[PDB]
Design a protein around this ligand. Structure first.
Ligand SMILES: CN(C)CCOc1cccc(-c2ccc(Cl)cc2)c1CN1CCN(c2ccc(C(=O)NS(=O)(=O)c3ccc(NCC4CCOCC4)c([N+](=O)[O-])c3)c(Oc3ccc4[nH]ccc4c3)c2)CC1
Length: 136
């Protein structure tokens, strides 16, 4: 598991393509995110209709959700839910003719990873351990 920016970009591109717009770690994360959205279906649907994205509320919407998600700490499932949440935000932004928000969201996700998730990820064997646990 190399660069966080690359992980974020490859993830967002996939989520957007699935909705008609535009390495083992990238594939494992993709598969995990699709599994998460299927298992927690009501949470997924509730999140998708509770963003109410506008040009000047997207930053605040991202901050409030990511704070609640990791309030009690970090684990692999919560990191998967964080990528899925980023995906939902990007898809809604493109759907609402606010596609430059995708670049802002990608930056907020990369910054959150580098600054607030990096220590946990490193202390738990990095993305390689995520692949050892959940990959092929
Ligand atoms: C109660 N309040 C606190 C509510 C507020 O909650 C808020 C607050 C804020 C936001 C949101 C929010 C709502 C909507 C959106 Cl879109 C985003 C976020 C919510 C909503 N929640 C966010 C956190 N969610 C969690 C957390 C941890 C775990 C966990 O870790 N479970 S697990 O059994 O360890 C596990 C099992 C299998 C696998 N992968 C296996 C795959 C198979 C396919 O091939 C690849 C590997 C993994 N894994 O990959 O990490 C781990 C969890 O469950 C699963 C179960 C199956 C899963 N599948 C892949 C991941 C996954 C996680 C669920 C619950 C919902």
């Amino acid at each position: 598991g190399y660069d966080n920016r690359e992980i974020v970009m490859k993830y967002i591109h996939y989520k957007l393509s699935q909705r008609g717009y535009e390495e083992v770690v990238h594939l494992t994360l993709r598969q995990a995110g699709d599994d998460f959205s299927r298992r927690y279906r009501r949470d997924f649907a509730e999140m998708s209709s509770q963003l109410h994205l506008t040009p000047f509320t997207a930053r605040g919407r991202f901050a409030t959700v990511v704070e609640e998600l990791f309030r009690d700490g970090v684990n692999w499932g919560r990191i998967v839910a964080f990528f899925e949440f980023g995906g939902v935000m990007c898809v809604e932004s493109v759907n609402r003719e606010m596609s430059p928000l995708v670049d802002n969201i990608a930056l907020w996700m990369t910054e959150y990873l580098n600054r607030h998730l990096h220590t946990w990820i490193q202390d738990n064997g990095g993305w390689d351990a995520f692949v050892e646990l959940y990959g092929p």
